[PDB]
Design a protein around this ligand. Sequence first.
Ligand SMILES: O=C(O)c1cccc(COc2cc(C(=O)O)ccc2-c2nn(C(=O)c3c(Cl)cccc3C(F)(F)F)c3ccc(Cl)cc23)c1
Ligand SMILES: O=C(O)c1cccc(COc2cc(C(=O)O)ccc2-c2nn(C(=O)c3c(Cl)cccc3C(F)(F)F)c3ccc(Cl)cc23)c1
Lengths: 261, 256
Amino acid sequence: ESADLRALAKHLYDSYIKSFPLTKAKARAILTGKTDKSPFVIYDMNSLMMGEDKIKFKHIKEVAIRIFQGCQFRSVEAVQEITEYAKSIPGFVNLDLNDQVTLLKYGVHEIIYTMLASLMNKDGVLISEGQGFMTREFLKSLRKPFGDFMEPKFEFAVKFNALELDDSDLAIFIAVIILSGDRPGLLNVKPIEDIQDNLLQALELQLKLNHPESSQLFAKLLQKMTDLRQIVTEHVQLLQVIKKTETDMSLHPLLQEIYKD
Amino acid sequence: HMESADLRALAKHLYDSYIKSFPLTKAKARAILTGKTTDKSPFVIYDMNSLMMGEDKIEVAIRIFQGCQFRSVEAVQEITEYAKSIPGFVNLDLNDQVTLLKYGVHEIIYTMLASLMNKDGVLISEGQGFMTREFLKSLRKPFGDFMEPKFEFAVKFNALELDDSDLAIFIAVIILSGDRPGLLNVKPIEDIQDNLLQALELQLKLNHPESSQLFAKLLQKMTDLRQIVTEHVQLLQVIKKTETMSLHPLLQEIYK
Ligand SMILES: O=C(O)c1cccc(COc2cc(C(=O)O)ccc2-c2nn(C(=O)c3c(Cl)cccc3C(F)(F)F)c3ccc(Cl)cc23)c1
Ligand SMILES: O=C(O)c1cccc(COc2cc(C(=O)O)ccc2-c2nn(C(=O)c3c(Cl)cccc3C(F)(F)F)c3ccc(Cl)cc23)c1
């Protein structure tokens, strides 16, 4: 059966590469400097202004709001990328349609956070498919509640990146998150746990072979699902406070529908 | 790291201490709950009158709260004594010992409270009593809905069918979490947990060989514990702003 898990691992790796614009391997080359050309750096107001005329941005008057909304609309794309990737997990599309929607609804936040770490180091985050790099200093120093909305993401990423996972590890881990049988309102939990039981076996085997000197990394990576749940819940508490205080965040109602999460 | 026979030695050490540290084992809890026993049989409290009769045998919502609290404090004492036997714990920096306990006792109390529960109620008074979920859930003000989440967790956790020899290692793994806030030396804590995790993995493989990926499923329960402990502390705060009950100093320090 071991070679079936390696086949599942490779299948997920291959699909992961097709689904997401910027892999972690490629992000690491950019971030470390062992890379091709150099990304545009946003480190203060003026450099943001020039970058807009340079790289494609996910936003479209105050600066902190625009950066916030850029994070949201980039998340809207990541949802579609994750949704396409989920369809390639063996067994997923045969699940009850309402269950597929439920798993995605409750999993995209944990996966976005997870994959955002691939694009971050302690000093900043890649944006616009790696062509830009926005610094932690600038993001953290944004006004009112936006500064303190950005910084928790880096604090998570820095801890998570200490596990030193590569894309072949992450392709299976992401699948494990999606196939969580404890999401509220699932109709048929059994086939979801059956699939997740397979992915877990594959994650375990992948980690033992790809990180043979990293003891109990499997266990440590599952413990990171504690950090993911925590931060997604406080994330939601943060969005509420922003929405109940900021009515200078007026968008066209159609855009508001699009990002309603 | 370890040879398999050292891990089995570690499992037995922890099971043995667990038995010495905790009054009411899960095996004894299941013997009382499932029944078929004329001697181990509990008095059942399901309403006000049976609560009045239970006092002679073995405000109402507050008195039950104080019953839960006094037992939690004893639980903290028992967990602390058990922690002292986990190899390496007492050799850790003294502030880290406090830190690990401060953040681990709530997750463990919840874990071990499940052992005393079924879907219909909870053992009390070292097993001599049994208070029903229905009665607890129906308490007034904020206390009814403070009781029910414990049952909601217990039913899910007990579906794993762990016995005490599994739980002894699981409890140790929780205590030795290197990701607790404010630890000074995470590495020695992680070396110990790597050993405890290796021991848990082997214990579950041998004691539940037909239960695939139980190790992973049990670790995913440490996620549920983090959420519920947080909701617990948030509920206690709201209750404190209406009820002037008071808390034991041991619990008082832990929640600061
Ligand atoms: O294009 C621009 O203008 C832009 C400007 C700033 C940052 C980014 C890149 O941001 C991301 C890229 C990717 C990616 O490419 O894989 C994924 C996520 C983010 C990102 N989501 N997020 C959130 O709050 C968030 C999260 Cl974590 C999860 C779910 C939903 C959201 C929300 F919808 F609410 F946003 C961030 C907060 C801080 C930072 Cl620093 C980054 C993110 C792009
Ligand atoms: O003596 C009576 O009258 C009595 C009547 C009902 C139940 C119990 C037994 O309860 C427990 C026994 C044991 C044990 O035996 O090891 C352990 C825990 C509880 C228990 N703690 N708790 C809490 O809110 C709590 C918790 Cl989880 C953790 C830390 C602090 C507290 C707090 F201090 F705030 F209470 C409960 C809530 C509901 C239920 Cl059902 C049980 C508990 C005794």
